[PDB]
Design a protein around this nucleic acid. Structure first.
Ligand SMILES: [Mg+2]
Ligand SMILES: [Zn+2]
Ligand SMILES: [Zn+2]
Ligand SMILES: [Zn+2]
Lengths: 404, 48, 67, 260, 484, 51, 46, 115
RNA sequence: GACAGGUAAGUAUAGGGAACCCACU
């Protein structure tokens, strides 16, 4: 059956599938195929077309089947990849210090469909047998493909300094003879990016082999994740009081800097930069100051994050979120912008009636100095709503423009 | 005579309670229609 | 509209508790005290009681379709 | 190469729950026992309803749902009862079902509370839990004057797996390794995690030192009954049913191998 | 048409409002003191936007409070409460100031879709479409503003134990696992009422319509559907089971198998339920006019839409019985499980805070207050309170895999949270076709599932197939399968 | 350039990790409503007769 | 044949015949309701 | 409308084999037992017992699809031993476990009742 | 005449459209 989701943006939006009938009243999709369809299960509906003749059936079977559609000509790189829970779980799984007991390896092995039926020698024999997620993933990997990637958190200096081929952080991926020698898999190594492990699998082994590869990764990693567990909570949004104090100090210093700049400009001591009126120069200075403050605060929060932090887990695995997202949650949200500028003076020289006139301060012009966890004062909330409205409008218009 | 902040929370919320008890939520609709019927119809008739 | 018979989460019978809970509330027990007296330890059952809204009285305010 | 030697200790026992501990057994066995408690213990609950009349504000499906959810004492009658599907009787019979009749009419200005008290059983041994002989009767619906509710129902055997209404338990707390000796979990900040009731540790201590050779033993159960069965009855019936399932599986395996 | 909002008047640096005013308002029931009396006394005053342009305003009396560096010191008004800037739909959001604004916007609409008790007297209204939840519940965490939206009287949703964890992967990508046992116990069960209407018109002596139980020997235009369910008046009776394409209003018209053409009204295809009730009247022109309300019990199932109050919606990916669901040390199991991947990008930190304070309030026997701009409430305070009740201060818990009993290496965030089931259910959207009725003008498949229509193989679908090079499949889709 | 077509279904989508990437779960109702024409041959004549 | 309908206002039973203008003989009220069917109806308590 | 009947979870449909045996050709002494209308309860207990068995080189179970109520148990034994024999002995040992636990629980319940 | 009971003879047990609005992905 051909399977479709409007809007049909590219070839992969319509792809063939083999039907399996299961009780309930929905189309059940494998998580990987969501990416090409650009589909989420937030209520999205999809269409299915049944070819009616053997000729059309053969056409679909030989041309449109998902395995054949794995790699797109648009950017000569795979369209699907391991996503979401599977991505985070594989990142955790392929950590250096992940060890599996006889029974756990037992379950994962049998979930691995393409398994040859031979239990590998455990990476540890005494004082007790123990395997490694790297061993199990080596079993998962098909053929004898060779690949080299770098985990997302891979420091750059490591490549130059000693331990180059023995990563202290295990942040370098090396698959050899179809065996994950070392490294922590992540989006870089399993997603749509070029030269990814899935890409190399498709290139070397058949599309069918890569299909089995996808299925085995998903099943095995989900089953292990059952044991491992993955969550997100207020604990992962909380930071230590020391980092809170550091962020507060940074914000206060940035506010003081903005105040100094404003006072200088009012004294007229400020002078325009080339190719910019004095007001443009002042705005540039303010924006630079606030951006630097936000960047410093985000860096502080990311540093404060612990290895157990689930936000960091997810960002590192690349499944979802971003360092900017973590910074917004933990430290200040940051400046709100409409039309690429600070909040305009909707009122008479005033963003809101609650400020003195001709106030160009961060708070006055809509800088959210509070993190999402800390909550927002009403003015900051209003300005953030303005920004979100800008985003929504941009979406609602670009949809039609790009369609045309 | 004044309202300390601790009291102020409950005070403002009591004020809002009284406001909503007095007005309701569709007060604008009801008042607009009532004013229309009461004044505007007669005004139109006379202006004719 | 009416107090559910079982706690959705754990399945503990709570349908026979709404009237007693109201009785305690009018007896001036705090909600937590009333729940403890009724024995609702798990916060699932505590939720079942706290969040319930007995709309059945408002429904009964209307006369039946038949005399 | 052979079975363990599980031991039991009942640390508490009431009409409404049983708390105990099982030692020298596998986590798999313990978890399966818990699952059987929750899902695969036979029970009698209303599953057939005929609404002769219903003037109440609630509709027929609503009323039937509540009636099914009502629990019924099933201490021994369930064991004698056979599953309706297994039973030969054409429609219903005592061997496979128990009849109930409800008939109330609000003839007074005050609200009439149709509670489980009004549920009239045919077999005295099977009755609403609250009606037993303080716990109040389970409300079903309220009737203003001029309203009526007449219906005839049948309760049959069944286990929670088919539907939650047959589920006897009302909370099966299960635990093991109170102190995290096996380190099956991992506390990023163990200090801030409250001690389990079964935890045996100094307050300064957060969790037991890791045990490389450890294995899950001494599983703590606290089975709360929904009043359908005595908790001890729940446990015993669960064990019996699990053994029955294993025996039937053994029979099927023997048949298959012999055929092969 | 000039909009306007109330504002507390400020003179010098002090509110005109006073403790005596507050007390009189408290006793409003007896002394009859009222908001109108406040306005008359002149403590409060209406302000429109144009006047706001000149007004200098303060968040709260805290701004009036003197400061080392007076910012304004010349205030003229003060907000009654900042939360008032929100609207009806936005008000029900707890901790809106802890969410990315677009999620608040989304919740503004998902709230409109939530099912609940839309009106107290629904039992009599023969509304065209209606949905009623079996067991509504006022949220455990409430903004003070809902006191006036009357959400307490007519809540739309259920407080549910939600665990934000990955479990079998069936909740991935904005999907949610659901407790089958809870669903059996009535969790989020609802009823859907549909009202059909018909009337017999006597427009012309030559041709007139009549309700009746038609018989094949007399009337001609009968489908193979059985008319026995009808009564002698051509109307079905309450308490009668009905399936799709089942006649419910036997109607006939006198022709100019003889002298009678069937104009009966059948139940909508693929639908089912029981006839809730029937009403018979005369329209404005005396013609007999019957409305039939039919109710169908919708049990939540795979594909049904659910949503929190924080822009987090998802379809029920799968339902696990209680024994399958993970459980705390106690017997508690999550009613719903939602993939953690929602929160990171969404910034629905308000969702997590709501879950935490919901756990706190449920344990404490109170109703949490999630009014947006409330400094008196914060995450640290909530965590301390939660820890006081013998729980992890951040809401995490030790959960056990249901299938194997083994502990879960991670500790799952879990707690009560107000969820709400949106009207869009899979049963009302599933649709399929194989050579159904076709349009009259062009012989292509009809449109819309109510007409057993066919899906539109649109222009971009044609183009995608062109790119695929499947010329024969394209030909089949556009010519042989549409209108040869 | 665009048309409505027979032998087309539409419905909500839900995740299912237990399906190969190239597979798709379908409700039994949709499958029943859908039919694929199969020509009779001595090979499949018995199977189609049973169908 | 009888076709008893319940009047909305007075909640009174009254026969109505086909072609008979819809109006409660008792109160002249034009809204009536069919009485609950007699057909056997059952509900598994699920 | 498509909701499967609840009893379908545990009720064998007409003409369904409760258990089926296959030989995993990939490796010797390996059998696959497909058991219908069963779930993690039986799967886990049997897997644990077989793992306890030392002759068992391989024992485990899985649920091919949660929406389906079938389980697959893969068991590989030493050449001098049969997967069928291992499976039977594991079931027997679990039955003995249940019997012993039942009687001990009866004794404990009695004793608690008296005091 | 009416009414209640019985016997005999005859009858009865093919599909809309447009417009608009709302809501949805
Ligand atoms: Mg979507
Ligand atoms: Zn509970
Ligand atoms: Zn019988
Ligand atoms: Zn009347």
């Amino acid at each position: 059956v051909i399977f479709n989701r409007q809007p049909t943006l590219h070839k992969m939006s319509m792809m063939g599938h083999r039907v399996r009938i299961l009780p309930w009243s929905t189309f059940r999709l494998n998580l990987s195929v969501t990416t090409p369809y650009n589909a989420d299960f937030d209520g999205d509906e999809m269409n299915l077309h049944l070819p009616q003749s053997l000729e059309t059936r053969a056409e679909i079977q030989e041309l449109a089947m998902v395995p054949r559609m794995i790699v797109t000509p648009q950017s000569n790189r795979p369209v699907m990849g391991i996503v979401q829970d599977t991505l985070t779980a594989v990142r955790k799984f392929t950590k250096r210090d992940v060890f599996l007991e006889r029974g756990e390896v037992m379950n994962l092995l049998m979930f691995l469909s393409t398994w040859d039926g031979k239990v590998p020698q455990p990476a540890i024999l005494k004082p007790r047998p123990l395997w490694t997620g790297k061993q199990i993933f080596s079993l998962i990997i098909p053929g004898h493909i060779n690949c080299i990637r770098t985990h997302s958190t891979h420091p750059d200096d490591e490549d130059s300094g000693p331990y180059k081929h023995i990563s202290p952080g295990d942040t370098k991926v090396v698959v050899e003879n179809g065996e994950l020698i070392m490294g922590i898999l992540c989006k870089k190594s399993l997603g749509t990016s070029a030269g990814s492990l899935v890409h190399i699998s498709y290139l070397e082994m058949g599309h069918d082999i890569t299909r089995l590869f996808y299925s085995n990764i998903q099943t095995v990693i989900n089953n292990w994740l059952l044991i491992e567990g993955h969550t997100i909570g207020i604990g992962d949004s909380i930071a230590d009081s020391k980092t809170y104090q550091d962020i507060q100090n940074t914000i206060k210093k940035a506010k003081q800097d903005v105040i100094e700049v404003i006072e200088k400009a009012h004294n007229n001591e400020l002078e325009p930069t080339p190719g910019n009126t004095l007001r443009q120069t002042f705005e540039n200075q303010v924006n630079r100051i606030l951006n630097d403050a936000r960047d410093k605060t985000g860096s502080s929060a990311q540093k404060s994050l612990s290895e157990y932090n689930n936000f960091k887990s997810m960002v590192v695995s690349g499944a979802k979120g971003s360092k900017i997202n973590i910074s917004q949650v933990i430290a200040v949200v940051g400046q709100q912008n409409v039309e690429g500028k600070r909040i305009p003076f909707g009122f008479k020289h005033r963003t809101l009636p609650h400020f003195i006139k001709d106030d160009y301060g961060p708070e006055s012009r809509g800088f959210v100095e509070n993190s999402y966890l800390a909550g927002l004062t009403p003015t900051e909330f209003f300005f953030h709503a303005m920004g979100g409205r800008e985003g929504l409008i941009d979406t609602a218009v670009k949809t039609a423009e790009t369609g045309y | 005579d004044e309202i300390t902040p601790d009291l102020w929370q409950e005070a403002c919320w009591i004020v809002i309670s009284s406001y909503f008890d007095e007005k309701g939520l569709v007060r604008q609709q009801l008042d607009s229609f009532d004013e229309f019927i009461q004044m505007s119809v007669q005004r139109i008739v006379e202006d004719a | 509209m009416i107090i559910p018979v079982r706690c959705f989460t754990c399945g503990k019978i709570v349908g026979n508790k709404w009237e007693a809970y109201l009785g305690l509330l009018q007896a001036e027990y705090t909600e937590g005290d009333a729940l403890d007296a009724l024995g609702l330890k798990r916060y699932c059952c505590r939720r079942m009681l706290l969040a319930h809204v007995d709309l059945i009285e408002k429904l009964l305010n209307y006369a039946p379709l038949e005399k | 190469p052979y079975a363990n030697q599980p031991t039991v200790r009942i640390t508490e026992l009431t009409d409404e729950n049983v708390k105990f501990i099982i030692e020298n057994t596998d986590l798999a066995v313990a978890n399966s026992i818990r699952r059987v408690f929750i899902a695969e213990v036979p029970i009698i609950a209303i599953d057939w309803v005929q609404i002769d009349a219903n003037s109440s504000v609630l509709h027929d499906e609503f009323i039937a749902h509540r009636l099914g959810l009502i629990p019924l004492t099933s201490d021994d009658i369930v064991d004698k009862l056979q599953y309706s599907r297994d039973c030969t009787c054409e429609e219903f019979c005592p061997e496979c079902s128990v009849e109930f009749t409800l008939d109330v009419r609000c003839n007074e200005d005050q609200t009439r509370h149709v509670t489980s008290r009004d549920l009239i059983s045919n077999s005295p041994r099977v009755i609403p839990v609250t009606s037993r002989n303080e716990q109040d009767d389970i409300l079903i619906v309220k009737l203003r004057k001029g309203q009526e509710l007449r219906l005839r129902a049948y309760a049959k055997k069944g286990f929670g797996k088919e539907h939650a209404k047959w589920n006897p338990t009302a909370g099966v707390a299960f635990e093991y390794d109170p102190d995290n000796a096996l380190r099956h979990t991992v506390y990023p900040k163990p200090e801030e995690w409250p001690k389990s009731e079964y935890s045996e540790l100094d307050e300064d201590e957060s969790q037991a030192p890791y045990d490389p050779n450890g294995k899950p033993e001494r599983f703590y159960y606290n089975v709360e009954s929904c009043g359908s069965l005595r908790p001890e009855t729940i446990v015993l019936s669960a064990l019996s049913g699990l053994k029955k399932k294993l025996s039937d599986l053994q029979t099927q395996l023997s048949h298959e191998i012999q055929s092969d | 048409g000039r909009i306007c909002r109330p504002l507390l008047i400020v003179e010098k640096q002090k509110l005109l409002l006073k403790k005596r005013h507050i007390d009189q308002l408290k006793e409003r029931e007896y002394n009859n003191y009222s908001w109108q009396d406040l306005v008359a006394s002149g403590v409060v005053e209406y302000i429109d936007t144009l006047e706001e342009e000149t007004v200098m305003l303060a968040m709260t009396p805290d701004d009036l409070q003197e400061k080392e560096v007076a910012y304004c010191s010349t205030y003229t008004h003060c907000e009654i409460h900042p939360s008032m800037i929100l609207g009806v739909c936005a008000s029900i959001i707890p901790f809106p100031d802890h969410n990315q604004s677009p999620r608040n916007t989304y919740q503004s609409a998902m709230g409109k879709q939530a099912m609940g008790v839309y009106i107290t007297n629904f039992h009599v209204r023969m509304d065209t479409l209606a949905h009623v939840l079996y067991y509504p519940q006022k949220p455990l965490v409430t903004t003070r503003s809902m006191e006036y939206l009357r959400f307490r009287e007519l809540p739309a949703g259920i407080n549910s134990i939600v665990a934000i964890a990955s479990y079998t992967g069936y909740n991935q990508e904005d999907s949610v696992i659901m407790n089958r046992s809870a669903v059996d116990r009535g969790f989020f069960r609802s009823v859907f009422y549909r009202s059909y209407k018909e009337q017999e018109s006597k427009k012309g002596f030559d041709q007139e319509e009549v309700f009746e139980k038609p018989t094949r020997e007399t009337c001609q235009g009968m489908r193979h559907a059985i008319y026995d369910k009808l009564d002698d008046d051509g109307l079905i009776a309450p308490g009668v089971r009905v399936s799709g394409d089942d006649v419910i209003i036997g109607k006939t018209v006198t022709l100019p198998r003889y002298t009678k053409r069937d104009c009966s009204t059948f139940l909508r295809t693929s639908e089912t339920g029981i006839v809730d009730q029937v009403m018979v009247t005369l329209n404005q022109e005396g013609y007999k006019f019957c409305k039939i309300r039919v109710r169908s019990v919708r049990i939540p199932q795979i594909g049904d839409k659910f949503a929190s109050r924080h822009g987090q919606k998802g379809t029920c990916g799968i339902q696990y019985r209680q024994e399958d669901m993970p459980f705390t040390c106690e017997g508690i199991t999550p009613d719903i499980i939602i993939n953690p991947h929602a929160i990171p990008s969404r910034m629905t930190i308000g969702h997590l805070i709501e879950c935490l304070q919901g756990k706190v309030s449920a344990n404490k026997g109170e109703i949490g207050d999630a009014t947006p701009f409330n400094d008196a409430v914060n995450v640290q305070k909530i965590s301390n309170l939660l820890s006081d009740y013998g729980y992890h201060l951040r809401g995490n818990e030790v959960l056990y895999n249901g299938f194997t009993g083994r502990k879960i290496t991670s500790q799952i965030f879990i707690g009560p949270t107000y969820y709400q089931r949106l009207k869009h259910m899979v049963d009302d959207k599933i649709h399929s076709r194989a050579r159904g009725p076709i349009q009259i003008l062009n012989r292509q498949p009809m449109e819309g599932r109510s007409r057993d229509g066919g899906l539109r193989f649109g222009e971009m679908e044609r183009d995608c197939q062109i790119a695929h090079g499947a010329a024969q499949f394209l030909r089949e889709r556009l010519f042989e399968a549409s209108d040869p | 350039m665009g048309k409505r077509v027979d032998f087309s279904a539409r419905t909500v989508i839900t995740p299912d990790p237990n399906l190969s990437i190239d597979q798709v779960g379908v409700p039994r109702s949709i499958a029943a409503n859908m039919t694929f024409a199969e020509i009779v041959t001595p090979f499949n004549i018995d199977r189609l007769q049973e169908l | 044949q009888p076709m008893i309908y319940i009047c909305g206002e007075c909640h009174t039973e009254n026969e109505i015949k086909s072609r008979d203008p819809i109006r409660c003989r008792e109160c002249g009220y034009r809204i009536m309701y069919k009485k609950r069917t007699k057909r056997l109806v059952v509900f598994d308590a699920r | 409308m498509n909701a499967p009947p609840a009893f379908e979870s545990f009720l064998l449909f007409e003409g369904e084999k409760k258990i089926t045996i296959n030989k995993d050709t990939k490796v010797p002494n390996a059998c696959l037992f497909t058991i219908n209308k069963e779930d993690h309860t039986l799967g886990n207990i049997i897997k644990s017992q077989l793992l306890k068995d030392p002759q068992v080189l391989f024992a485990g179970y899985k649920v091919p699809h949660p929406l389906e109520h079938k389980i697959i148990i893969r068991v590989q034994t030493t050449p001098d031993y049969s997967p069928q024999e291992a499976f039977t002995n594991a079931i027997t040992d679990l039955i003995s476990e249940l019997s012993l636990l039942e009687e001990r629980f009866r004794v404990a319940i009695k004793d608690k009742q008296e005091g």
